[PDB]
Design a protein around this motif. Structure first.
Motif, PDB file in Angstrom:
ATOM      1  N   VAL A 280     -38.124 -12.306  18.442  1.00  0.00           N
ATOM      2  CA  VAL A 280     -37.590 -11.307  17.524  1.00  0.00           C
ATOM      3  C   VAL A 280     -37.032 -12.028  16.303  1.00  0.00           C
ATOM      4  O   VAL A 280     -36.669 -13.205  16.363  1.00  0.00           O
ATOM      5  N   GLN A 281     -36.980 -11.315  15.182  1.00  0.00           N
ATOM      6  CA  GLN A 281     -36.413 -11.845  13.951  1.00  0.00           C
ATOM      7  C   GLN A 281     -34.911 -11.590  13.916  1.00  0.00           C
ATOM      8  O   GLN A 281     -34.411 -10.644  14.530  1.00  0.00           O
ATOM      9  N   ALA A 282     -34.194 -12.453  13.194  1.00  0.00           N
ATOM     10  CA  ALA A 282     -32.747 -12.313  13.077  1.00  0.00           C
ATOM     11  C   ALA A 282     -32.390 -10.929  12.552  1.00  0.00           C
ATOM     12  O   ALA A 282     -32.922 -10.479  11.534  1.00  0.00           O
ATOM     13  N   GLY A 283     -31.488 -10.251  13.261  1.00  0.00           N
ATOM     14  CA  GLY A 283     -31.163  -8.868  12.992  1.00  0.00           C
ATOM     15  C   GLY A 283     -31.908  -7.873  13.855  1.00  0.00           C
ATOM     16  O   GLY A 283     -31.622  -6.672  13.778  1.00  0.00           O
ATOM     17  N   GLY A 284     -32.847  -8.336  14.676  1.00  0.00           N
ATOM     18  CA  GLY A 284     -33.632  -7.460  15.515  1.00  0.00           C
ATOM     19  C   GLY A 284     -32.896  -7.055  16.778  1.00  0.00           C
ATOM     20  O   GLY A 284     -31.691  -7.260  16.937  1.00  0.00           O
ATOM     21  N   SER A 285     -33.659  -6.470  17.703  1.00  0.00           N
ATOM     22  CA  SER A 285     -33.112  -5.945  18.944  1.00  0.00           C
ATOM     23  C   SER A 285     -34.051  -6.255  20.099  1.00  0.00           C
ATOM     24  O   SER A 285     -35.269  -6.351  19.927  1.00  0.00           O
ATOM     25  N   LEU A 286     -33.465  -6.401  21.284  1.00  0.00           N
ATOM     26  CA  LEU A 286     -34.220  -6.612  22.509  1.00  0.00           C
ATOM     27  C   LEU A 286     -33.453  -5.969  23.652  1.00  0.00           C
ATOM     28  O   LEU A 286     -32.223  -5.893  23.624  1.00  0.00           O
ATOM     29  N   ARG A 287     -34.188  -5.505  24.658  1.00  0.00           N
ATOM     30  CA  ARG A 287     -33.588  -4.920  25.851  1.00  0.00           C
ATOM     31  C   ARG A 287     -34.082  -5.673  27.075  1.00  0.00           C
ATOM     32  O   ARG A 287     -35.288  -5.718  27.339  1.00  0.00           O
ATOM     33  N   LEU A 288     -33.151  -6.261  27.815  1.00  0.00           N
ATOM     34  CA  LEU A 288     -33.464  -6.944  29.056  1.00  0.00           C
ATOM     35  C   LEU A 288     -33.215  -5.998  30.222  1.00  0.00           C
ATOM     36  O   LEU A 288     -32.330  -5.141  30.172  1.00  0.00           O
ATOM     37  N   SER A 289     -34.025  -6.141  31.265  1.00  0.00           N
ATOM     38  CA  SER A 289     -33.843  -5.369  32.481  1.00  0.00           C
ATOM     39  C   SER A 289     -34.079  -6.278  33.671  1.00  0.00           C
ATOM     40  O   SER A 289     -34.908  -7.192  33.625  1.00  0.00           O
ATOM     41  N   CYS A 290     -33.331  -6.021  34.738  1.00  0.00           N
ATOM     42  CA  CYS A 290     -33.416  -6.851  35.931  1.00  0.00           C
ATOM     43  C   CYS A 290     -33.471  -5.963  37.164  1.00  0.00           C
ATOM     44  O   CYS A 290     -32.634  -5.072  37.329  1.00  0.00           O
ATOM     45  N   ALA A 291     -34.493  -6.176  37.994  1.00  0.00           N
ATOM     46  CA  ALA A 291     -34.730  -5.350  39.179  1.00  0.00           C
ATOM     47  C   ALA A 291     -33.987  -5.963  40.359  1.00  0.00           C
ATOM     48  O   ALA A 291     -34.429  -6.956  40.941  1.00  0.00           O
ATOM     49  N   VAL A 292     -32.851  -5.367  40.705  1.00  0.00           N
ATOM     50  CA  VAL A 292     -32.093  -5.770  41.884  1.00  0.00           C
ATOM     51  C   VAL A 292     -32.803  -5.208  43.109  1.00  0.00           C
ATOM     52  O   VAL A 292     -32.935  -3.990  43.258  1.00  0.00           O
ATOM     53  N   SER A 293     -33.285  -6.091  43.980  1.00  0.00           N
ATOM     54  CA  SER A 293     -34.066  -5.676  45.136  1.00  0.00           C
ATOM     55  C   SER A 293     -33.528  -6.326  46.403  1.00  0.00           C
ATOM     56  O   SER A 293     -32.921  -7.400  46.363  1.00  0.00           O
ATOM     57  N   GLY A 294     -33.753  -5.655  47.532  1.00  0.00           N
ATOM     58  CA  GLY A 294     -33.338  -6.184  48.815  1.00  0.00           C
ATOM     59  C   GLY A 294     -31.845  -6.249  49.020  1.00  0.00           C
ATOM     60  O   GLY A 294     -31.381  -7.038  49.846  1.00  0.00           O
ATOM     61  N   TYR A 295     -31.074  -5.440  48.298  1.00  0.00           N
ATOM     62  CA  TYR A 295     -29.623  -5.468  48.398  1.00  0.00           C
ATOM     63  C   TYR A 295     -29.119  -4.355  49.308  1.00  0.00           C
ATOM     64  O   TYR A 295     -29.800  -3.355  49.543  1.00  0.00           O
TER      65      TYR A 295
END
Lengths: 133, 286
Positions: free
Chosen positions: A11-26
């Motif tokens: 991404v370029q400076a000033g941009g946006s990103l969304r991280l996601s994490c799949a919690v499994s086996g909990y």
């Protein structure tokens, strides 16, 4: 217990990103979930944490507000919305999970306080430009 | 004259002015409370503590105590000789009345007052004091008793029947609004968490005392530390082998010097939102 992250990239400076994490086996109990990041040579550091009990969130000073951590026990996902990204935000990003823990309110951002880890997704924020003014 | 009726009422640590009329001394009922009690007080049970001998009147022995709304009415053994003919009335905002300000039971001056629409009196003279009364003189029509001091010289009070003017209650926190004091025991707990996480750069060779630390804490708007705070951090001191007073010396250096570009647990600011309960439980599994 397994954890898999998603949503990294460039991404370029000033941009946006969304991280996601799949919690499994909990066990679906009260836990600490954290988003960590690590630059080359630099140590790994927690930047945003959430307690799945009351949902209280903590952010380190450098990423507060710009990043927002979320939880979705229905879909078993923990998310990190990253806005107004800076080149210093370039790092590998890991999601992390504690063991079951009840009675607390706020989750510490130290790696020592987490047991299970994802594989890590890379976020690259670039400052390159080719135009004059 | 109200000056001769003014008296000093002491219960435990607390002390304020009282109004001495015949054998009854009127005063705010929160004289029975300390700072800890004022948070949200059980006035029924706190008054069950107090007996007639616990209250001290200086103009005297109290022969009875009766609570009427928010005023305490103390029956004393000696009747007041210069008691004016008096009545109890309730005014409205915007009506002028005279207030006799007293500190530690001795009058200071007579100020003309008028309650604002929010039922408060704005004035610096009442600050540092509690229990002064207001009145209109023709018969002396007592209309007001000072109960609560609010941060910016704003004062709440009742009539002589003990009913507050406006939506105010005789409850208050120990810390005033806008103080924004940092929670020292939480910062210390967070520092212990940093050591358990491997952050040691801030630990120095020094120890300190509660007195020396609290001088710095007051300077930097931190909660002063007590032995109770020290005991609370007990599990973390035992886990790390670092005495609380040794960690206090590290924090003192951090307050006087700053972080000098470094971070602790990923933060460039000293964090005080983690309670010792949060930290103790999370550090236990390590």
């Amino acid at each position: 217990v397994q954890l898999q992250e998603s949503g990294g990239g460039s991404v370029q400076a000033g941009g946006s990103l969304r991280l996601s994490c799949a919690v499994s086996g909990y066990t679906y109990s009260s836990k600490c979930l954290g988003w960590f990041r690590q630059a080359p040579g630099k140590e790994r550091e927690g930047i945003a944490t959430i307690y799945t009990g009351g949902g209280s969130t903590y952010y380190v000073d450098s990423v507060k507000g710009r990043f927002t951590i979320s939880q979705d026990n229905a879909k078993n996902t923990v998310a990190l919305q990253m806005n107004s990204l800076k080149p210093e935000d370039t790092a590998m990003y890991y999601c992390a999970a504690s063991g079951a823990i009840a009675g607390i309110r706020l989750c510490l951002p130290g790696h020592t306080f987490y047991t299970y880890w994802g594989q890590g997704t890379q976020v690259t924020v670039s400052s390159h430009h080719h135009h004059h003014h | 004259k109200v000056e001769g009726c003014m008296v000093q009422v002491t219960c435990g640590t607390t002390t304020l002015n009282g109004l001495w009329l015949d054998d009854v001394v009127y005063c705010p009922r929160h004289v029975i409370c300390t700072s800890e009690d004022m948070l949200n007080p059980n006035y029924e049970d706190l008054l069950i503590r107090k007996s007639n001998h616990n209250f001290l009147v200086q103009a005297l022995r109290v022969i009875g105590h009766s609570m009427q709304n928010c005023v305490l009415k103390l029956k004393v053994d000696t009747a007041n000789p210069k008691t004016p003919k008096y009545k109890f009335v309730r005014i409205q905002p915007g009506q002028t009345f005279s207030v006799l300000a007293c500190y530690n039971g001795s009058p200071s001056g007579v100020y003309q007052c008028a309650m604002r629409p929010n039922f408060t009196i704005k004035g610096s003279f009442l600050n540092g004091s509690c229990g002064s009364v207001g009145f209109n003189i023709d018969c002396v029509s007592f209309c007001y008793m000072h109960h609560m001091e609010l941060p910016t010289g704003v004062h709440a009070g009742t009539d002589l029947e003990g009913n507050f003017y406006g939506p105010f209650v005789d409850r208050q926190t120990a810390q005033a609004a806008g103080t924004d004091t940092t929670i020292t025991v939480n910062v210390l707990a967070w520092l212990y968490a940093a050591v358990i996480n491997g952050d040691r750069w801030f630990l120095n060779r020094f120890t300190t005392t509660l007195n020396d630390f609290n001088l710095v804490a007051m300077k930097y708007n931190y909660e002063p530390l007590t032995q109770d705070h020290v005991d609370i951090l007990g599990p973390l001191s035992a886990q790390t082998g670092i005495a609380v007073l040794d960690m206090c010396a590290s924090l003192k250096e951090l307050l006087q010097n700053g972080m000098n570009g470094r971070t602790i647990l990923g933060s460039a600011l000293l964090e005080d939102e983690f309670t010792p309960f949060d930290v103790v439980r999370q550090c236990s599994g390590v």
